[PDB]
Design an enzyme around this catalytic site. Structure first.
Site, PDB file in Angstrom:
ATOM      1  N   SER A 138      22.058   6.497 -72.837  1.00 18.95           N
ATOM      2  CA  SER A 138      21.039   6.375 -71.773  1.00 18.95           C
ATOM      3  C   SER A 138      21.722   5.798 -70.488  1.00 18.95           C
ATOM      4  CB  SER A 138      19.901   5.507 -72.316  1.00 18.95           C
ATOM      5  OG  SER A 138      18.733   5.475 -71.500  1.00 18.95           O
ATOM      6  N   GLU A 183      13.206  12.652 -76.622  1.00 15.59           N
ATOM      7  CA  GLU A 183      13.616  11.624 -75.699  1.00 15.59           C
ATOM      8  C   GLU A 183      12.431  10.927 -75.013  1.00 15.59           C
ATOM      9  OE1 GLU A 183      16.665  10.440 -75.022  1.00 15.59           O
ATOM     10  OE2 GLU A 183      18.038  11.995 -75.858  1.00 15.59           O
ATOM     11  N   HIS A 192      14.331   8.391 -78.598  1.00 11.61           N
ATOM     12  CA  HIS A 192      15.369   8.009 -77.689  1.00 11.61           C
ATOM     13  C   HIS A 192      16.024   6.768 -78.295  1.00 11.61           C
ATOM     14  CE1 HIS A 192      17.168   7.114 -73.789  1.00 11.61           C
ATOM     15  NE2 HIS A 192      16.621   5.901 -73.799  1.00 11.61           N
TER      16      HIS A 192
END
Ligand SMILES: *[C@@H]1O[C@H](CO)[C@@H](O)[C@H](O)[C@H]1NC(C)=O
Ligand SMILES: *[C@@H]1O[C@H](CO)[C@@H](O)[C@H](O)[C@H]1NC(C)=O
Ligand SMILES: *[C@@H]1O[C@H](CO)[C@@H](O)[C@H](O)[C@H]1NC(C)=O
Ligand SMILES: *[C@@H]1O[C@H](CO)[C@@H](O)[C@H](O)[C@H]1NC(C)=O
Lengths: 528, 528
Positions: free
Chosen positions: B197, B324, B437
């Site tokens: 990320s 995600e 995610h």
């Protein structure tokens, strides 16, 4: 005598015709308007002066003056649509097929031909009314109306070429039917107007236009609706095209009087020869002279009329064919040919969409392309061809009809929707064109019942149920005999497929693509 | 002694740690910068002054000051991401796990944590480097960097709070590794930076930034890329948010000096308490202080750098997870809850898209909605929830990563792409969130090899192959051992799924949706 009918305009003598080993009566070429010739060219139609003596109605009338398709000389696929009679500006006649013995007061169906408002004939073999009249015991009428510049040249404000006169021709024929069909055994209170493509758009136009509403009971629209993007133009665009036509004929352009006078002296073929030169864009599925939103025949914009319920409330039956766009691409988009599978490259796909949405800026063109491209397989020729076919059909026929049906149904008294997807086993057009625009007509007119035409037994059966659905709807306002075709409703939006397989009911006909064409794209083009 | 290492900054004493019934060495909390406290808050990091004597590196360091997630007090799903050490502005340390016996010159992997640039810790149990170090025989390093206002407050032109200092912290740690990892047995010429990320976006930023390129050999980016819409802001937006932060703390706003001075006197928690108040829109997946396109760390716009090949050319391995967006919707979109299936009404779907694409005009919002709505079933709650999940993930992670990969691959020396879609059997988050995610991290760090953590045998096997793919790529620039993960190429665009089923190769990862997000929508918002 069964063949002699006395009408308010004079006596008419018909002819006996054979049909499926029987016979019915036919009154061909009955005049319903004065010949729109000379100084009457471009003018509103005048009613036919009554005649004394007997009008010979044993043979087809002339067809109106029009562009003639010569793309495939001798090919039956295209020539079956061309005028099969001598052309003449003296073409305002109607034909009637009457069951034998003469009915007393039966259901009437009046056919209005298509042809993009630039062509069409009521005398085509595919429009022979004898099979339907005979099989369903209805009085079948086909009218005619001026097309091309002769029917739609529009110089708003001028009383000499006001526009919409072709629509007024259709109205006059409906008036004549209203006033005289009783003498042929027809019930003037139960007349259904029905037509295909421009004929279907015309049907919707009579539903909208206050001056036409009272002349018919219900309506059937095949592959066409009044709000189609190619079916009308503003008075300003009409004016600009009228002037551009004059400019092509070296006309004095100082005044409407000067212009109209010049256009009236030109022979018919001079106008037809340059007719296509007035289109504003390089385009496909767009025609030069079409109906004008004039504030008279159409009191206001078509959308505000649809939105406000400003239209005739009754029952309607309508629908589309699966591959409405193939014809138009064959005739005018790069990469398409009559004798190949027409697999389209990515570059031709793109030049295809530009032709299909002439009025679109680049963002709009990109929106269309993205909406119809499979990005996992963008070089697939079959996919590109079919994608283009759907863009043309969705934008020009299906989505406008779906917009009309959803607006109509809010105020109407009953809607029945079909999706015709059987491709005739004897089609001479190539396979890639699918269930082609116009090829449900032969089933509506019952050609599959005549053995020599080579259809399959199941095709004959399909034709029989379509004819009976159409005739029963005309008679009752419901295609079903008291397996059911359900009513289309605002909530459910149900429709049926029309083919040789057991009826199947579905919902929300092409919703995904039509929300794109009816809601998103217009919002997009208006903001950019 | 195996636990004593002599570096250029001083001697450091590690600690022996058990791992999968064996042991390796750990040097925890080695300082790499002077403490960025007092008047050094917001400033670029300064290198750690060498110390004499022995630095005790037996325990984890403090974590940087940050917002702490309290949405689900005590819930392990969210607290496993929160700081597990006392927080302190004195937080610039790095940790090293070294195989035992000490390697001589082996592959090095440096982890850069995510957390939206506003949070994150190098000390989290899911980031424990011992399993990877031990299993793959690599020297594993995790660095730390300032987050939130402390790391990214940007007042361009000021040398006191120039912006990007958090990125400069990461660079300093990479410099330290370059200069000292040899003493721990690591090969400074074979260092792979990898992160998830914001950590993955950081990785891409070091690939772009001229001043960072020389400090590492190759890179791995998980669920993040430098061009992500939430990863950077203009110097003007940075300036506006810095000022708005000051306005929230009643700071004198006459000059940058006045502003910075005021912000430097506030205790850490005062800044954290109002941090979220500076966002320009009501949004989801947007963070206040992030990297700034300043003309220094980033010489020009990220897109022009990607377009021109202005970046480090090497091999990269990267990818995304299937769902995600679920996290961000759970935390901030109406209708989503931790304990229900979160079926979304049509109205919540629409308020969801507005939150997801904060920068969009109404036409843009309509384009997104149409792109993700199934109009044959628009009230389907599951479909609305999942559609929203994809909008968030596609816009924020997947499509930006796909844009980066396609641009990178034109100039790089090798790309390997994955789509991680195995949902852990022991996930405590609800089913509707899918393959969330951040939940591929536990497999990259090998948590499935520790029996008490309750994964399945096949999950352990998956973790082992991911670890070996990651380590082999770090060592060679190719994840395969000399069934193959193919190279991603401009032409073929191949990628593999990463799960417990036999590897499967696919192509054009989410092309359809990404042409929408990377080509059409931006063109649309720019024209309107
Ligand atoms: C009617 O007109 C047709 C067309 O020429 C002609 O052949 C036919 O003999 C006519 N019949 C009468 C009674 O005039
Ligand atoms: C049509 O109108 C009739 C008479 O007003 C009414 O009884 C009927 O409910 C309507 N049918 C539909 C389908 O709207
Ligand atoms: C290193 O620091 C830890 C943390 O307090 C301490 O417990 C340990 O005994 C220390 N060891 C030495 C040799 O200073
Ligand atoms: C990577 O670079 C090397 C050396 O310049 C070259 O031989 C090789 O073809 C490149 N590999 C790829 C996948 O581009």
């Amino acid at each position: 005598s069964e063949l002699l009918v006395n009408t308010k305009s004079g006596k008419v003598m018909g002819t006996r015709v054979p049909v499926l080993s029987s016979h019915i009566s036919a009154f061909l070429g009955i005049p319903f308007a004065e010949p729109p010739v000379g100084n009457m060219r471009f003018r509103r139609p005048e009613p036919k002066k009554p005649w004394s003596g007997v009008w010979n109605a044993s043979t087809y009338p002339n067809n109106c003056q029009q562009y003639v398709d010569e793309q495939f000389p001798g090919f039956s696929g295209s020539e079956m649509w061309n005028p099969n009679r001598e052309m003449s500006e003296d073409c305002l006649y109607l034909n009637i097929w009457v069951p034998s013995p003469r009915p007393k007061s039966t259901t009437v169906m009046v056919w209005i031909y298509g042809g993009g408002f630039y062509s069409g004939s009521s005398t085509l073999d595919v429009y022979n009314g004898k099979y339907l009249a005979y099989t369903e015991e209805v009085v079948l009428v086909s009218l005619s109306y001026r097309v091309g510049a002769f029917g739609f040249l529009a110089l708003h404000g001028s009383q000499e070429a006001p526009g919409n006169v072709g629509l007024l021709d259709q109205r006059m024929a409906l008036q004549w039917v209203h006033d005289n069909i009783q003498f042929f055994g027809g019930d003037p209170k139960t007349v259904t107007i029905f037509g295909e493509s421009a004929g279907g758009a015309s049907v919707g136009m009579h539903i909208l236009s206050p001056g036409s509403r009272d002349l018919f009971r219900r309506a059937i629209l095949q592959s066409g609706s009044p709000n189609c993007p190619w079916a009308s133009v503003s008075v300003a665009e009409g004016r600009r095209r009228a002037v551009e036509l004059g400019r092509n004929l070296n006309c004095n352009l100082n005044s409407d009087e000067e212009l109209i006078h010049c256009l009236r002296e030109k022979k018919p073929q001079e106008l037809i020869d340059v007719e296509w030169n007035v289109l504003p864009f390089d385009s496909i599925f767009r025609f030069s002279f079409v109906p004008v939103i004039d504030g008279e025949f159409f009191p206001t914009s078509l959308e505000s009329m649809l939105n406000s319920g400003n239209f005739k409330k009754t029952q309607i039956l309508l629908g589309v064919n699966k591959d409405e766009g193939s014809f138009f691409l064959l005739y005018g988009a790069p990469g398409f040919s009559k004798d190949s599978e027409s697999k389209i490259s990515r570059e031709d796909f793109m030049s295809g969409v530009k032709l299909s949405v002439p009025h679109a800026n680049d963002l709009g063109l990109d929106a269309v392309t993205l909406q119809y491209t499979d990005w996992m397989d963008d070089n697939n020729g079959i996919k590109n061809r079919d994608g283009l076919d759907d863009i043309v059909g969705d934008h020009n026929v299906i989505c406008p009809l779906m917009h009309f049906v959803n607006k109509y149904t809010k105020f109407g008294n009953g809607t029945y929707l079909y999706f015709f997807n059987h491709r005739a086993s004897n089609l001479v057009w190539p396979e890639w064109m699918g269930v082609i625009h116009g090829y449900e007509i032969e089933f509506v007119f019952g050609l599959p019942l005549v053995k020599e035409l080579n259809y399959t037994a199941e095709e004959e059966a399909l034709s029989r149920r379509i004819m009976h659905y159409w005739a029963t709807f005309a008679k009752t306002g419901n295609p079903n005999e008291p397996s059911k075709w359900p009513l289309f409703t605002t909530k459910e939006q149900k429709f049926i497929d029309l083919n040789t397989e057991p009826m199947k009911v579905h919902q929300r006909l092409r919703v995904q693509m039509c929300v794109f064409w009816n809601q998103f794209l217009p919002k997009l083009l208006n903001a950019t």
